[PDB]
Ligand binder design. Structure first.
Ligand SMILES: [Ca+2]
Length: 223
């Protein structure tokens, strides 16, 4: 997260870290057996780490659980990043408590100007590299689709929205990939892509989760 703040330990209790020997992507817990993250975070051999704040120190509230199956969206296009969403089922159900909680799926899409919270353990510098050990948070608005498509001509589909700041300096970044964008208590977005991080006139692009609720609900029920 570039230009955000330290969240505070376990204040985003639905945030998941995907680990394959190291942290490489974020995710969101949507019920005790299922996680949603981005398709561009697919790997074989994922362990889902719940209850995390410092990902380098075991602090007492973590649950480490291996994925039993991963389902990448049937129409994910890795070149356009269109339909960038994947479901991960846990080998055993997480124990929900104050520090491990699920987030609700949206009943409708959010409008431009709604304020959201984005969170992740990804890169914190726009020019350079510095990876945090504790969860970073950023408050950011959904932007008009006009300013989203003018920043990226011909690349935005109906399954994508922009959120952030056109002046730059505040954005999600690699390492935040697959993580939550929550607006009004609902999971509205997944950290998907952008041009670098926190560059002027190049906002973050996010998977528009409200287009996918039927596929999510039908797939978790049959798996
Ligand atoms: Ca930890």
């Amino acid at each position: 997260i570039v230009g955000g703040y330290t969240c505070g330990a376990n204040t985003v209790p639905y945030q998941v870290s995907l680990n394959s020997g190291y942290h490489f992507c974020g995710g969101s817990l949507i019920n005790s057996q299922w996680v949603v993250s981005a398709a561009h975070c697919y790997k074989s051999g994922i362990q889902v780490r719940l209850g995390e704040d410092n990902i380098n120190v075991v602090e007492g509230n973590e649950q480490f659980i291996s994925a039993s199956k991963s389902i990448v969206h049937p129409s994910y296009n890795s070149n356009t990043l269109n339909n960038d969403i994947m479901l991960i089922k846990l080998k055993s159900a997480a124990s929900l408590n104050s520090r491990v909680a699920s987030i609700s799926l949206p009943t409708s899409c959010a409008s431009a100007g709604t304020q959201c919270l984005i969170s992740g353990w990804g890169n914190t510098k726009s020019s350079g590299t510095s990876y945090p050990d504790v969860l970073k948070c950023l408050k950011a608005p959904i932007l008009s689709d006009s300013s989203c498509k003018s920043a990226y001509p011909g690349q935005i589909t109906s399954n994508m929205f922009c959120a952030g700041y056109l002046e730059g300096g505040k954005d999600s970044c690699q390492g935040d990939s697959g993580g939550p964008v929550v607006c009004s208590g609902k999971l509205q977005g997944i950290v998907s892509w952008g041009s670098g991080c926190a560059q002027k006139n190049k906002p973050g692009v996010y998977t528009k989760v409200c287009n996918y609720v039927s596929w999510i609900k039908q797939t978790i029920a049959s798996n």
